[PDB]
Design an enzyme around this catalytic site. Structure first.
Site: not given
Ligand SMILES: *C(=O)[C@@H]([C@@H]1NC(C(=O)O)=C(S[C@@H]2CN[C@H](C(=O)N(C)C)C2)[C@@H]1C)[C@@H](C)O
Ligand SMILES: *C(=O)[C@@H]([C@@H]1NC(C(=O)O)=C(S[C@@H]2CN[C@H](C(=O)N(C)C)C2)[C@@H]1C)[C@@H](C)O
Ligand SMILES: [Cl-]
Ligand SMILES: [Cl-]
Ligand SMILES: [Cl-]
Ligand SMILES: [Cl-]
Ligand SMILES: [Zn+2]
Lengths: 242, 242
Positions: B47, B95, B227
């Site tokens: 991402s 993302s 992170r």
């Molecule tokens: C990118 O790397 C993936 C997406 N990116 C992220 C992220 O950077 O956290 C997620 S998880 C989703 C989005 N943010 C939320 C979070 O971090 N939490 C609440 C724990 C849930 C995706 C998997 C992409 C490749 O799928």
């Protein structure tokens, strides 16, 4: 179009304060305030004039970009945060008037006056010093007029370059988290009665933008933090921020 | 130029984690990391590729501005926040891969490849699906190469319009307060082993900018909060943020 919610007055009274908060819901195109009369009374902008000042200085080339250093002139002043070098970002955060006074001098009366009318800003009067009229001159602006001006800047509709408006909205950055972004400017008018504090700007959400303009009587400096506190209490009450 | 501070490893081990934090002090042109070798280890961007993808989509007219709505395609995916409409700002905040995959397809292989070389981005290899190469294709980038790319973005020195770079840096806004601004992008690589988390960006102070790039082994999703946590614990230890 405009509704008066007098229940917000409890937020002023609980801090032994009086003033006005104006909110504008950009999605529904509705305004709300605790005091329709004071919402439309015009005061000196004081440091909130940093916004139109910066837009004009950028568009005319007086300021190249947000990185250009404005070196200290050597003179040590009452506010410690002014006794250092600044750029456009830090000048806005610490309301460094000497920097904005230099901006206005290089802009000039004729260009300042034309630009403020192009902006439809306040009463469009620069009477007084070209470089202090926003502190002790004839320029006046009301809270509802601040909203109208801020709404144009949000939409890049001001009669300046898009780049100028993007840079100034970057300098206006005040707070951000997973729930909201606040772009705003404080003000503290002392040279003419009544002494007042300002907080004008907007709250960016995922799906909406809430503009706000507040002012409150500020007879003493100890209550300066009430500008943000009272505004956020109203924002919390209306469930705009958690 | 570079200095290894192995004491930061305590921030990884105390969470039963392994990874690297790379910091770059822009004023002093000095770099710091807990692991010089892993600082140069290249992984899938996942991402974090949202940053160069957005710049290219903006510079080529694929995206008009930060307000243009990208309608949800109706396909219900596992992440609920993807199952809604988005703009460039909320796409980066949540993302939303389907948005970025649509970006990539409209950019095309030839333009994607040319621009990543102009960007000097990682190993510049787009092998695989034009809409999944940053997820399960051949592109690889190290934490130090991420910083190299972000430093160009900060200074508007990437081979794209200044407006394109200003809009993306606005979308990168993650946190802001009276002490600092964080512009950054998270990443979570799950398609190809090893599964890793990313956080790349920079911290803006009044008088300096601290670029950072971190990645860590992410065997289980419950550690995703580490992170930011590990990065901020290192930032606090170096007295960069309170
Ligand atoms: C990118 O790397 C993936 C997406 N990116 C992220 C992220 O950077 O956290 C997620 S998880 C989703 C989005 N943010 C939320 C979070 O971090 N939490 C609440 C724990 C849930 C995706 C998997 C992409 C490749 O799928
Ligand atoms: C602008 O209105 C004036 C300056 N702006 C502000 C303000 O908006 O708050 C101040 S007061 C400044 C902020 N906090 C400082 C403080 O109390 N300490 C560091 C102890 C003082 C300025 C007066 C402009 C007209 O000067
Ligand atoms: Cl003053
Ligand atoms: Cl209005
Ligand atoms: Cl911003
Ligand atoms: Cl995925
Ligand atoms: Zn810890």
């Amino acid at each position: 179009m405009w509704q008066e919610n007098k229940s917000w007055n409890a937020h002023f009274t609980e801090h032994k304060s009086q003033g006005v908060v104006v909110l504008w819901n950009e999605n529904k195109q509705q305004g709300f305030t605790n005091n329709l009369k004071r919402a439309n009374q015009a005061f000196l902008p004081a440091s909130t004039f940093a916004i139109p000042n910066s837009l004009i200085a950028l568009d005319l080339g007086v300021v190249k970009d947000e990185h250009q250093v404005f070196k200290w002139d050597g003179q040590t002043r009452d506010i410690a945060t002014w006794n250092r070098d600044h750029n456009l970002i830090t000048a806005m955060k610490y309301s460094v008037v000497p920097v904005y006074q230099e901006f206005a001098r290089q802009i000039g009366e004729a260009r300042m006056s034309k630009m403020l009318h192009a902006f439809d800003y306040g009463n469009e009067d620069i009477s007084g010093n070209v470089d202090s009229f926003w502190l002790d001159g004839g320029i006046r602006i009301s809270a509802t007029e601040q909203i109208s001006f801020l709404r144009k800047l949000y939409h890049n509709k001001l009669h300046v370059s898009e780049r100028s408006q993007r840079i100034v909205k970057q300098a206006m950055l005040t707070e951000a988290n997973g729930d909201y972004i606040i772009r705003a400017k404080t003000g503290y008018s002392t040279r003419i009665e009544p002494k007042i504090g300002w907080w004008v700007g907007w709250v960016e959400l995922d799906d909406n933008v809430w503009f706000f303009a507040m002012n409150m009587d500020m007879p003493t400096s100890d209550g300066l933090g009430l500008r943000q506190a009272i505004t956020k209490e109203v924002l919390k009450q209306e469930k705009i921020i958690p």
